[PDB]
Write a protein that binds this DNA or RNA. Structure first.
Lengths: 282, 282, 282, 282
DNA sequence: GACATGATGCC
DNA sequence: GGCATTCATGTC
DNA sequence: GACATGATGCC
DNA sequence: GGCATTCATGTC
């Protein structure tokens, strides 16, 4: 139905793969040729299906009737998730060989910042597959199901988690703190203290976030990257990044990684996916 | 040449009219058959042009190639500006009579909540034409002209206005406090303190807002209305509203307005743009 | 066994009577000729007895054995409780006829600024009789008893009230918010944010107290008057006072009292205990 | 004239010796057999003199006519300055070896928390001698010279120092930050933010003090020691202490010292005054 | 990983 | 010594 | 109109 | 009485 353009190359397998390693049971559905999920925009809802057209470097988007009144915003969310805006060779041109291996690499964003906020928090300490299982449990319990599509369930809204009880959340399998951090986050959402859109001054914006309970500099950096699609942010405290720069302290990794300015968010993703990348043997 | 749907009726005359009176030179163009303006999404810039198609119950939108990478968000910004989600058959069924004469009414939104904030402030205690000239100045002095279309100019981003001299602003015609308020607002917009999207709790959000220098309840409400497009807001502190509700106080008005919940914003528009209106004896 | 003299006149039947209506059971004993109470200065405990020797305008203070390692401090407390520094000449000369009735009128302070804080808050709304009852109940629940004087119980420390259960204090006959105030006051005392001695800028000090939950303008003034023995404070928003100035709004009364600087506290006392008194409608 | 009791033993030579080394010209006078200094309690000023009576186990204290109205408080201040409450049997008993050679050791207090704070600040980084003359200059400038005894000047009041030009002090001989520190301390004092008396939670009060500009943990501690006469503080950051504990980080010294509570303040002193002192190797 | 705590230089 | 910043610890 | 100040009910 | 909210009122 609706269609959006992107600029070649676009590694859809990599993107669809990435999104799939984090897909949430009953909220998302990832296939080799399309991504599909529940979606809410105020009281409006339904399902969004995105199908790439490698041939016409186009992305087709289908909305269920429930979402039609807000079609546009839906489209905007998808474009932010997929990073259509990305001009692959402006980025690659500044990343030399670091990306040469896969020039179609895009920044996996999100369809909702609050959700991404919840996602980045449950991702603390644990594995990607576990954070997925976890987020599913939280969704299963606090997320509202679709009348129109039973098989689907909407991601928990801010006000549903705000009223949630720590003990209940904790029960799902997370420490008491993690749960409280989630209940705080939802309140800043209702109050509009959590930026749902990429702020002008990202750093300051991030600092503000780290004052939030349960949100450290890692949670803040990663959220900046996914929730805001911040393109020039690196992660010196990331598990892997540590293991990718063996023998270095957070400020040398940051001080090192600052050579990929202003596209560090991309340099980060490349390093994550270059199987055996060791800093330049110089 | 994209296209967006809308449910009829839709008083296009009324809308454009409303947008024309407050149109800012170099920034916006409003003809009786189309609306066009300068737009900026981050660092992407160009010019938007919407052309209502009454036959099709459709809004056509063309995009300056400089905005094609971010077409989706652009389309979303227009849909918010024109209130494309509105199911009038629902709103009017709710207000009954008050909206019987102008069933095609829509809430005139904005293209960017920050811009609309600036606009709200510069709209304080002055005629519409007045403010649309004051503002036009600001956009002339702190705006990013386009190369693709020199004729237009982008609204001042928060970074260009954040680092502005109070006197520099004041000198275009506004108390110093007013120039100060825009400076503040601009800051919250850099550290994500200014909610760029309708928050869950709009009362709370507004209350917070009010602590912002240069912002009172009137400005908060008008901001929530145009900036967030909140549908159940009313301005009992407004100049004309006082006139429409003779000898009645903010409180009296406010609760009389309670009869229109959850669509007090539409009710407002109907009363404003309906000269000679007056409350009942019950 | 200890003497501290005073300048005449000194209305003792009035001082004691006052301290009598407000006397707290099991903590204070007040008769026609002497005053006695439990007293604790840190880990030092014991009873204090005050016996005025009108004939030789000297006050006889006796101290239980446990307080002797801190006699000086006890004496100082006793002297702030009885306003022995007062110079009847200066206040009465400055006041004129206002105090011609009772020149021995003194400013009744306290023995511990925290205690007084707990009294002031409790002295809220209820009658003086009620207050003493309510206060005594708290002392019974949180006070330290004395081995040598089983009939006496020490007034509760901040260390016990900070740890108090608001519901426990509530069950004693006070609104939840009122108990939440005691606890806050108690905590303030622990971190040292409650002035235990008259502060350089009484005014600013008081303004800061009002920021405390539970403390309004009245409590903050009555605290300053009794707890710091500030001599130039007035209670324009007090009950009885309002009666003393019929038809006058706090600001009026208050503008009137300016005529008494800097002995407004003393002024207040006389006007309070001069039943007839009325302003000069000139 | 007045007499205060003290429990034996009391090493008067050491005590008077310690005050002497830090005696401030025109403020204090220290001699083999007595101690004298100016003293103002509100608008009551005069000179205080303390003369120990080894024979009768007592401290004699005379006050100039100016302070007689507030004499009891002068006695209390003196009792705090000379630690008259101290029971050597208790402290020493518990302290063991440490206080075995000089069992008459006492905690040199102060006669005014504020002044003491000032002293703690001015005494930073420089030698006891510097601080003394440094302080002296401050007193001669913002002080209140006594008419009855012109060679004496009352240590400057908060209101006075709060309103001093930070550059005037810089001139007296101190960094501009050491000066703003005084202006700040003085403001806190004007409004009651500076605990003029020992708090319930001494730990929490010190933590708070360090927020004060110019005040660190060292000062915050030294302040709790002399200003509040806290008996359980240690100074693991003192230049000399670090020397008495060679090759031990503050946290280590700190933990070792835990063996002297609740009298770590005394232990400190003892240790301070023992050249070849060193912790037990085991 | 969040978070409190413990271990160079500058001015 | 206060103060800023960057490692390095160590529960939970 | 924002924004100080003063001057009715619900706890 | 604390306290949040409301109706003038004067100012910039």
């Amino acid at each position: 139905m609706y269609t959006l353009n992107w600029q070649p190359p676009y590694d859809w397998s990599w993107m669809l793969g990435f999104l799939a390693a984090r897909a949430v049971s009953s909220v998302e559905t990832v296939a080799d040729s399309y991504y599909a999920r529940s979606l809410a925009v105020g009281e409006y809802r339904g399902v969004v299906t995105a199908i790439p057209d490698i041939a016409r470097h186009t992305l087709h988007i289908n909305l269920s009737a429930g979402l039609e009144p807000v079609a546009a915003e839906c489209l905007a969310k998808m474009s932010r998730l997929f990073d259509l805006q990305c001009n692959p060779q402006i980025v690659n041109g500044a990343l030399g060989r670091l990306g040469a291996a896969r020039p179609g690499l895009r920044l996996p964003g999100c369809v909702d910042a609050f959700e991404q906020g919840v996602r980045a928090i449950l991702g603390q300490l644990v594995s990607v597959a576990m954070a997925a299982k976890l987020t599913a449990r939280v969704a299963q319990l606090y997320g509202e199901r679709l009348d129109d599509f039973p098989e689907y369930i909407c991601f928990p809204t801010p006000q549903r988690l705000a009223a949630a009880d720590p003990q209940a959340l904790k029960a799902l399998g997370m420490p008491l703190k993690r749960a409280e951090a989630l209940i705080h986050l939802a309140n800043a959402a209702l109050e509009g203290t959590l930026p749902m859109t990429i702020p002008g001054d990202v750093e300051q914006a991030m600092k503000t976030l780290q004052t939030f309970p349960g949100i450290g500099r890692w949670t803040a950096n990663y959220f900046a990257l996914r929730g805001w699609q911040a393109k020039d942010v690196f992660l010196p405290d990331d598990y892997l990044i540590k293991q990718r720069f063996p023998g270095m302290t957070p400020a040398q990794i940051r001080r090192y990684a600052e050579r990929w300015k202003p596209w560090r968010s991309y340099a980060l993703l490349h390093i994550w996916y270059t199987e055996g990348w060791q800093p330049d043997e110089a």
